[PDB]
Amino acid sequence: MIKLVFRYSPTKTVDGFNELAFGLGDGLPWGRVKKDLQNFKARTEGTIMIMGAKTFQSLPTLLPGRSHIVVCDLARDYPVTKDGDLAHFYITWEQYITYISGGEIQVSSPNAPFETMLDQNSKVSVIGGPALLYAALPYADEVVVSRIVKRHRVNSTVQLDASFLDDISKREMVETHWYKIDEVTTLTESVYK
């Protein structure tokens, strides 16, 4: 089971052009929104989270309860959390593609012989790095996308391609949740199959 779990904020540039804010430095364009974080935890519960190196680095520390697999260039130093934590498993892009495309891979701890099997029965959530998300979409069983809307502009250093959201909209939407976070913020979490 492969689930995509990500968020974005449709916003405007200083000149009024549209853009889909995805990342802001080592954080999020909309900052820290309680409901957003709560939804994330519920959606990733009981799954093995897969993310890119910068996504792992953006974490203040390991998220409790879930295994963190990081896809990165192993020829470089291991990426760590803001608190210095290492991931449970680090895999190459080749392993990542072999897995999401329907294969099975063996993952091993970073500084230990321990290794286990990640196959098509494993429950996985792909969360960070548009590259990882775009690569997994054709093989995903479920897509959980959140749209955070702010009254005023939000900045970003990483954006999402509108074509990506378009490809997702082709899928069957089966669930949608809308929340008035505050006077200038709304959050919509939608589930596609």
Ligand X SMILES: NC(=O)C1=CN([C@@H]2O[C@H](COP(=O)(O)OP(=O)(O)OC[C@H]3O[C@@H](n4cnc5c(N)ncnc54)[C@H](OP(=O)(O)O)[C@@H]3O)[C@@H](O)[C@H]2O)C=CC1
Q: Which of residues 118-147 bind a copy of itself (CB under 8 A)?
A: 130-131, 134-135, 138
Our finding on whether 93 is near a copy of itself (CB under 8 A) is yes
- Spatial contact of 148 and 7, defined as CB atoms under 8 Å apart: yes
9-42 CB burial, b ≥16 within 10 A, e <16: bbbeeeeeeebbbbbbeeebbbeebeebeebbee
**Site track for a copy of itself across 38-57, x = CB under 8 A:** --------------------
Q: Which of 24, 63, 137, 165 binds ligand X (CB under 6 A)?
A: 24
- Spatial contact of 43 and 144, defined as CB atoms under 8 Å apart: yes
Residue 25 annotated as binding site: yes
Our finding on whether 78 is near a copy of itself (CB under 8 A) is no
Residue 87 annotated as binding site: no
Residue 164 annotated as binding site: no
**In this structure, how many other beta carbons lie within 10 angstroms of the beta carbon of residue 171?**
14
Helices (H), the chain: 34-44, 53-57, 93-100, 130-136, 162-169
Cα separations in angstroms, 10 against 74, 99, 114, 129, 180: 34, 31, 42, 17, 16
Instruction: Give which of ligand X, a copy of itself, none residue 24 binds (C-beta under 5 to 8 Å, depending on kind).
Output: ligand X
Q: Where does this chain touch ligand X (CB under 6 A) — which range of 49-57, 61-69, 163-171, 183-191?
A: 49-57
Q: Which of 28, 33, 118, 136 binds ligand X (CB under 6 A)?
A: 28
- Spatial contact of 156 and 29, defined as CB atoms under 8 Å apart: yes
Residues making contact with a copy of itself (CB under 8 A): 72-73, 92-94, 96-97, 101, 130-131, 134-135, 138, 161, 163-164, 166-167, 170
* Residues lying near ligand X in the complex (CB under 6 A): 6-8, 22-28, 51-55, 58, 72-73, 76-77, 79, 98, 103, 127-132, 158
